Amino acid sequence: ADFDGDEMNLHLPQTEEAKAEALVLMGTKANLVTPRNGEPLIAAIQDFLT
Amino acid sequence: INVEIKKIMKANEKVTSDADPMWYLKYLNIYVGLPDVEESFNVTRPVSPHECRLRDMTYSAPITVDIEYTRGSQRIIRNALPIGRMPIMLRSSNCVLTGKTPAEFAKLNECPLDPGGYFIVKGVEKVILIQEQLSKNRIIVEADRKGAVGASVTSSTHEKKSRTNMAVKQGRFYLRHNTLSEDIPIVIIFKAMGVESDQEIVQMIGTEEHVMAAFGPSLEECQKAQIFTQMQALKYIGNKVRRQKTKIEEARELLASTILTHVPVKEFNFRAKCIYTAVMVRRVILAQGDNKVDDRDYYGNKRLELAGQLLSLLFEDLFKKFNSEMKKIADQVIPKQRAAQFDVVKHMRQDQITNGMVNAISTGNWSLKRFKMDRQGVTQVLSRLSYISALGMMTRISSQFEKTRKVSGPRSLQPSQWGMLCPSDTPEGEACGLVKNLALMTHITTDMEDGPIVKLASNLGVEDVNLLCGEELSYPNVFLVFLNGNILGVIRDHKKLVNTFRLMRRAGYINEFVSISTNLTDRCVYISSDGGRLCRPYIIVKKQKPAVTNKHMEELAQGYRNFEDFLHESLVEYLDVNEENDCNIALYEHTINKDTTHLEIEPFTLLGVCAGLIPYPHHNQSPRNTYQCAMGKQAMGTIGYNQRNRIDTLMYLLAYPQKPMVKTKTIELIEFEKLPAGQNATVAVMSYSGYDIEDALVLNKASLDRGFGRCLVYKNAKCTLKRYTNQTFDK
Amino acid sequence: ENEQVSRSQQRGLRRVRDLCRVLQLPPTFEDTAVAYYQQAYRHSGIRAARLQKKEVLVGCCVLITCRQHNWPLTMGAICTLLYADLDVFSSTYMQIVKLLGLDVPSLCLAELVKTYCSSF
Amino acid sequence: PGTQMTLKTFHFAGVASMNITLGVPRIKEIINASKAISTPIITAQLDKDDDADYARLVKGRIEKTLLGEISEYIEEVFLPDDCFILVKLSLERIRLLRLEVNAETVRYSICTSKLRVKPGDVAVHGEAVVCVTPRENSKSSMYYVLQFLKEDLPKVVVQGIPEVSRAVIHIDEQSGKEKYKLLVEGDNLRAVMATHGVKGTRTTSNNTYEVEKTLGIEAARTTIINEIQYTMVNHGMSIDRRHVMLLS
Amino acid sequence: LPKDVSVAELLRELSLTKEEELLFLQLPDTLPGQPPTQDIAENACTLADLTEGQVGKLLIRKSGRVQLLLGKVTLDVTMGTACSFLQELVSVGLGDSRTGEMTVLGHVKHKLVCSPDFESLLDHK
Amino acid sequence: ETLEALILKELSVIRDHAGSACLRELDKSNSPLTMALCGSKGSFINISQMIACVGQQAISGSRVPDGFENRSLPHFEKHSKLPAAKGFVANSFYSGLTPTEFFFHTMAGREGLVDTAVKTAETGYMQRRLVKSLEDLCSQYDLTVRSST
Amino acid sequence: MLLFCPGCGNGLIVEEGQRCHRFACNTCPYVHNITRKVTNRKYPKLKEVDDVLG
Amino acid sequence: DDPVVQEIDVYLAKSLAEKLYLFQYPVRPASMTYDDIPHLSAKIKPKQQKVELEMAIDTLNPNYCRSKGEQIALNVDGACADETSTYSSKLMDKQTFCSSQTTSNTSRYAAALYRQGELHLTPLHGILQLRPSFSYLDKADAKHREREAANEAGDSSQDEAEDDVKQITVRFSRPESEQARQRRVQSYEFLQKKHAEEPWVHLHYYGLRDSRSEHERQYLLCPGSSGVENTELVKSPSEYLMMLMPPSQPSNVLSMAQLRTLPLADQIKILMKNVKVMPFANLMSLLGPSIDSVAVLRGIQKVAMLVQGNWVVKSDILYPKDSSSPHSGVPAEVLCRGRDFVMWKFTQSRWVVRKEVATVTKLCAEDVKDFLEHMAVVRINKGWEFILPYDGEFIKKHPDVVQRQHMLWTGIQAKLEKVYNL
Amino acid sequence: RMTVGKLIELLAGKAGVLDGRFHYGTAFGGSKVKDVCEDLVRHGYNYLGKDYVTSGITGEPLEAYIYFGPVYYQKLKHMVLDKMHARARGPRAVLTRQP
RNA sequence: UGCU
């Protein structure tokens, strides 16, 4: 994203099992790296590196 | 509405039925009149475009005609009879807005700065975009699907349009047409078109060693068969002809009229057509070597059809349909109705043409069966997001492709768009490269008579093509001269011809819009006089000094002369793409060298209307300018001085709009400063609070409270209370 | 429907629509005219009638549709565009109105005045 | 990675020629495993990688050489006794290109899939002269077939593999030593490996179908993996080898 | 065979040799004259309307210019398409309504084209 | 092609030398330079393009093709292979770009835009196919990857 | 080469008569006996020595 | 570049104007001629010229195949019919050259015979291209068709008397529609039949080697003196140009030429309505020196007034009676009064105050700005100054005009003082 | 993005609002940078747009100068109030029972 | 038709 008018979707699970699976498997703290080559994608960005 | 409608009426002036001879319906003169509304009870009343928008009706004028017919063998005439309603374009010759001052515009509830030029039907504003297609009656040499370098020609006359191709799939030239069962050799067609001597055929094709070596296989394949006479060739063509000596007659008819319709034959004299196919085969042979393949994206071979030609074709088709319906009704009524003599007035449908035009302008889908043309998206809703948005949408251009394939060829920016179309203005998305906008300074030519052009060409020593054989076509100094795809003849020392033609055009005896180009690779001088061609004004430069001077500019500023006087005094002239391809142009005065023929008027005119708002665009990137134009097409601001009385389904206005501080000459010209679409704010480039990480910005609470950025959204909610068939109404 | 219809009724409907489009009356007027024509054709006396009878029926249905909306239209022009004579026109008009009994609003004077003044 | 790649150009792999399809189109062709691919590349090693003479020799051996490309002139001479086509081979250019082609080799190449010309029709008079005297076949063909012979004779293969179209000598200038290899834009790996002087043990090809049909399914898998890895590295983006291994 | 020019052609036809030669020149559609008592109109004036005698002069200036002074205006004569095929000039005179005579006058080798000097016609007025 | 390659090499050398000179003359504390050093956004290439000189406008990995007959624009002589006539941009964004340079830059930009537009759909289709083909495999407990069957 | 009949102009083919090979047309009795040697060279472009790449 | 030498004369001949034709062979090079080929006859027509030459070719030459000649003769003709034979003997002896018409009109083409010091021009009555025609093949095809028919009929040894009486198959001469009749008229068969309807004319051939050739070659010349002034061919270059190119048939819509083509009064009126400020010398220079100064003065005095030596267009000329203010919509009379007041203020003093003018005329700022810009410019710290300087030359040259303008301005001042109550 | 045109526009607008003028940003021309720098140095402001600015939060001056100036910002029709969406159960389609 |  670039915060230039992007419309993003937000969904709310309707089941406790689905909620737990989303929190565990799709956790932001657990998916800090991509399975392509293991490089971290969630890191510093412009206005933070500088 | 002034000339083309009259020409169509003259072409379809007389209509009669086969049964009951001596009966006819003759049209004398057709009128469009002024815009009126059929609201009152059989009474006309002037109606304004704003009133039409408010009442959700069409802004059209009653089409009337004076006719004469024979009811019972007694000629009865009518001086004024309505037959339809033609939607009148705003700011046209017959529109009520033209020739009006701002005070009268205010009285009529219309903005003076409104660009106009759009139709109003059922309350919605539709604009007919400019269609961009390929030039007709032109040979195109290109690679085939598998990669066979062949040629094609789409001969389009006022009646039929036929595309015929020529391939070298097997080392020999096979001609393919939609009316033949199988592609036949070109030598058989040569023998059928009168020229039976193989020596003459080879001399017409060419006298070069490689030309003969490449054409040998065709002669061998022709000699393999027993085809040596015109009769045998025509019999073979007839046997190969598809169903729609009788076969020989049909073959001759297809060779004379169907194949290469643009090449005329005086009386079954195929000399011109033979020379044309010989030149085509010569071009194909020359291209079979060095890969000098012509490109389709070259706008010098493009034609722009404005709304005028589309409306003329639609009106012609509707008038033909009406004539056919009237003839059918007559054939059905007159022979068995009663002794009461029948006349057309009782069945003259006055709503046919009206509904046809209304649907063609509203739905946007045009289906002309007489020409087999099925187009869509011709008309689009005028975007009233802002004055800039409307002014930029009014000058758009759609392509014939219409997102068929991601070719990238026509979508790429070709150097031929110099001074004609805006390079940076293009919608960002799937339509990138297919939707374009005209430049700030450009013009579209119309059709001329072509009489004096041919007369001057014949008087300048152009030798008749029928007087000499085709061997002269293979000489290096003999240059062919073409006129709108038709072989005008041959000439020697084409420099003198071009110079004299340009001098005559500058003098004024020839229309300034007739273009003349010369291609040396093929040795062809093209004289273009058809409409739709893009032209641009240029100052004439002679001997390292332009013709326009400070004295002329001072006279223009004081009002002694005008642009027409400049055109007449051989100071500024219109150049086409094909003409500038050969002529040399200079950007500035310091760039003028010895080899210069013209001078650029202004460089900033290269950009379009939407791009003219960019301050200092030559200091930014191209994608930046593209996104800037795309967002200016949606910018929020005032629309016009009648924005309060205007009622649209969705409108966005700004509370305190302010004109830019850094305004461009294009802005001053388009008068955007009078209707700005933004505000100037004291911006500080810096990072603050980290809430502006990726393209975001931080606003001031107090600034927003003091009225900065205040916007107004106006929506419309419409309701209808109509009466049904029964005597009941919604209440 | 549209299948249990005779060629004569279809010709009558097409003539109604043609005269409506010639007079340039709205599609609501066209619908009302075709509806009244069907309602009149329902009867057998008008069903098995003369050709001039059914032509005057088309004319009178158009006239009734024009009157029902307070629209001025002269019976003279109606007869002129209908290929009929005033005598038989009035006779069949009286017959059909006595057979049906539909509302016949009187012709307003001001509307006809405006319609005729627009002609000059 | 398909979206990350921008489909750049000018990536000739250091040869400044032989435009090869790399990127999303190449990945598409690989995942489709088409029998015929666009611009196939075969890389072959040499036993004598330092001798440019031997490199050229094997190049001429593997590359298709047409008759018209080596013959200096072909003339259809009609002597008052008989008509025949005389081809003059340029022995100078032959020895310059280092092609083992003589009059006997040209005669043997002729009479192969050419309207069934009998051996007695072709004859040799000098050291570099070839005389072809056709005969009427009676199948809608008469003595006037010398034109078809002039049309299709110069395009007859005399030496090299018919499938090979263009073989070039690539050079690796490693500081240790400058070695030579063969880059063939053909679709025949079996013939390239069978040719003399080519180290068939270190011959690779880009056509997965040919690699499968020649060296087996494991060779095809290895070639697919290597090609995908190379195509992905050309764009500067890396992928774990396990993904391509699982795909293959 | 190098492409010759009209001035050198006339020079080598008159000075280098004295044998007569048959030429074929293409004149403009309308000549700068009026049909003399031909019942009119500004119509086309061709050679069929003019009478016999001296009608114009042929001048050869320096630098290879070849002009034709046919009155107050001056046309320019250039070399036409170099025809290499056989061209036989013949006169077919039908002296009698039943029998005529075809007389081969000579052969045509060179072709000339006369064109109005539009530049001069424009700069004059 | 040899002349083309030599001209491109000369232009690249000029570009690199101009960029090096700009980087050596620029003083520290400069915001563009600091951002290019830290890698947050921008780079030395963009800095040199917007300060020192813009690089050669390359279309499909080559110079601007001749749109007109034997020349890109009518403003240049025929058969002219000069850098400024074939696509070289001598001026920088700060000093302003000439009309021809701006037109060539717009050509390159539109080329890149259409390339990305085609790439979007092409990679979408490729990803759809690859996923529909590989959505059946899974890692079992016995360390053996098996399909659905 | 490509030869044509001076009489009609059609292509001439090489055939064998009763005395010597001759050019003849397929649409007229015109013929032309061969007296001396006749040749038609084409000089096909030779394959240049492709130099090493790199 | 002067005519140093080669001053050749041009003469015209009309002896063979209607008897001169141009025959050219596109398939025969100029090297080989038909002077040695014996000709037999030539078929021609007066109208729709299409000549067909019938020549003879040798047979004993080595370039002729006797077997193929016999074959083609037996194919085109019968065994011994010889009633309608394309060849007298059993060999191809005659050759047929057909003529094709290049153009309909050949008046622009002329044959030029060059002699020592003179060039004789003779018009051409027709130009035709001669090419070897192939009709013996069509006749052979017809012969083969009739032979196949005869074979089909004689398939049996003895053919019984066939009862194939021709029933009366008289079809209707149906009335052909106009479209079908036009199609039939434009069909190739109809044109061919119309051309064939005209009878042929046979002519003998006289080669160049004959004495008749040199006898008739002299008719291309004309008896006349060396120097004769032609009565015709005396039109000027402008007349020749008009002949060879005959014609087809804001307030600045009219161009300079369209303006000059109008009367002097309309010219001056349009120039004033366009510029609104121009000296008399500039007006004279624009109109032209051929127009009289008194006429220009009489024309300008009716549509302009004198202000500080310069001429300013009147207010009513710019604002007609039916016009109105494009910014406020006030009637044209008020605009005329305001413009007259502005002109009076300018004549009284070179510096005019916009605020004072507005306060006096009670007009709006935009109208005052337009009135001031029409005839003045903005000067800092001084207000509005007249765009042109004081022209005293015209005042000194025309004193009576100055007095007339002064009294007119006095009357206008009286009217303004009466209206605005100054 | 190499948007030096934005900086040039900002400097020109600052000079214009200071000197009571309207600078021109005409393509391939317009007011040069030297003219606006002269205007700024005549009016007393920095010739590069950067001015001494004090932080409002901490009240201490910033180590680097801030680039202030008037820029012509234009608001677009894309509104978050219109683009915001939240779907409960809501209705469904007749053919396929889905939102 | 626009948006990312």
Ligand SMILES: Nc1nc2c(ncn2[C@@H]2O[C@H](COP(=O)(O)OP(=O)(O)OP(=O)(O)O)[C@@H](O)[C@H]2O)c(=O)[nH]1
């Ligand atoms: N606002 C808007 N306008 C559209 C839309 N789709 C089509 N139009 C109009 O229709 C034209 C092109 O639409 P098309 O893609 O041809 O319509 P389509 O091909 O049927 O698109 P599909 O419905 O996806 O097949 C445009 O140029 C618009 O005129 C749309 O989705 N939104």
Ligand SMILES: [Mg+2]
């Ligand atoms: Mg985004």
Ligand SMILES: [Zn+2]
């Ligand atoms: Zn022949």
